[PDB]
Ligand binder design. Structure first.
Ligand SMILES: CC(C)[C@@H](NC(=O)[C@H](CS)NC(=O)CCC[C@H](N)C(=O)O)C(=O)O
Ligand SMILES: *CC(=O)N[C@@H]1CC(C)(C)N(O)C1(C)C
Ligand SMILES: [Fe+3]
Length: 328
């Protein structure tokens, strides 16, 4: 197995006002997006030093009682409103991964989309503050920290595609973003349950099968344990780990609106028997957000593709991925 070219891009100019410097970042984003589709954002300003400990302590200190109490509808029939947000339980002997997903903190009972009962909007559920001191505060602040990084990155992607820097970010708003954080624990297990290991067509043992992301972009922090592979014409290539940077790639919403100029890279998760933490942030727009497609390869930039409303895209995408690659 070969190794993917995944450049480390200093994204700090995207927070500044040096426009030429922003363009030089955008060129690097362009080149990565046209190559394997992945790059590492470095010099990003987020304090990642404790992200792994908090995630691990939360998952290791939360009890079975609390997991049922926070469980999404797939694990608890009593929680019909928790489709996206809540705890995703492991199944000892069968399923190793466990996670906790939360959405926009501004989705409260008073929010208009919650009052309208619009799909994909949910009020977050949280554990008991006394049993998990500071956890909710940490998690909500992290949401906005990675929101800010994602906003800057979206300015880089817009410039990379020849647009003004707010072409994407203008649709990415704290009041309505459908973006999500998932705090994933991949455990060390001995023996490791065979049922939790899938064998790819090429024989590689996997924890999660090939897929394109349901997102505009995906902004991921992970522990320093190599596991991701990206598919190229020459086969799957290993993505090296970097527990200081954020791994960035496009989702299928970006591929659609660019007439596949920036593809949504197909990737998968190798099985590795090692305790590790994964914290993806799925950059989703608002429910009614629509971006007019275009084709940067054509002189006139025109695309025949239908503009897709983001909320319908997300509803269709999250169900499709569950069907192909299983309930997580
Ligand atoms: C590599 C990571 C992204 C992670 N995989 C994942 O997060 C996988 C594939 S991108 N993602 C999903 O299943 C979609 C989660 C959507 C979330 N509940 C939401 O409602 O918004 C892994 O480490 O397995
Ligand atoms: C799991 C984790 O958060 N590790 C971080 C990553 C980094 C920035 C390299 N730090 O050194 C830690 C604490 C090892
Ligand atoms: Fe993915």
């Amino acid at each position: 197995v070969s190794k993917a070219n995944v450049p480390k891009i200093d994204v700090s100019p995207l927070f500044g006002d040096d426009q030429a410097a922003k363009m030089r970042v955008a060129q690097q984003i362009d080149a990565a997006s046209r190559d394997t589709g992945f790059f590492y954002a470095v010099n990003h300003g987020i304090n990642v030093q404790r992200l792994c400990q908090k995630t691990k302590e939360f998952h290791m200190s939360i009890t079975p009682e609390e997991k049922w109490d926070l469980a999404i509808r797939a694990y608890n029939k009593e929680h019909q409103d928790q489709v996206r947000a809540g705890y995703y339980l492991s199944i000892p002997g069968k399923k190793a991964v466990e996670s906790f997903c939360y959405l926009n903190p501004n989705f409260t009972p008073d929010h208009p989309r919650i009052q309208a009962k619009t799909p994909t909007h949910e009020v977050n559920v949280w554990p008991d503050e006394t049993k998990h001191p500071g956890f909710q505060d940490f998690a909500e602040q992290y949401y906005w920290d990675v929101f800010g990084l994602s906003s800057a990155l979206l300015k880089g992607y817009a410039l990379a595609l020849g647009k003004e820097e707010n072409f994407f970010a203008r649709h990415f708003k704290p009041d309505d973003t459908l973006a999500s954080v998932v705090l994933i624990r991949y455990p060390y297990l001995d023996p490791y349950p065979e049922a939790a290991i899938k064998t790819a067509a090429d024989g590689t043992k996997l924890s999660f099968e090939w897929h394109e992301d349901v997102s505009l972009i995906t902004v991921l922090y992970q522990s320093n344990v190599q596991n991701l592979q990206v598919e190229t014409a020459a086969g799957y290539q290993d993505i090296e780990a970097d527990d200081t940077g954020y791994l960035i790639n496009c989702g299928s919403y970006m591929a659609h609106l660019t007439n596949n100029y920036y593809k949504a890279p197909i990737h998968r998760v190798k099985w590795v028997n090692a305790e590790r933490q994964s914290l993806p942030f799925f950059v989703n727009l608002g429910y009614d957000s629509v971006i007019d497609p275009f084709d940067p390869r054509e002189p006139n930039g025109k695309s025949d593709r239908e503009p897709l409303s983001y909320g319908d895209y997300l509803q269709n995408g999250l169900v499709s991925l569950i069907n192909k690659n299983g309930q997580t």
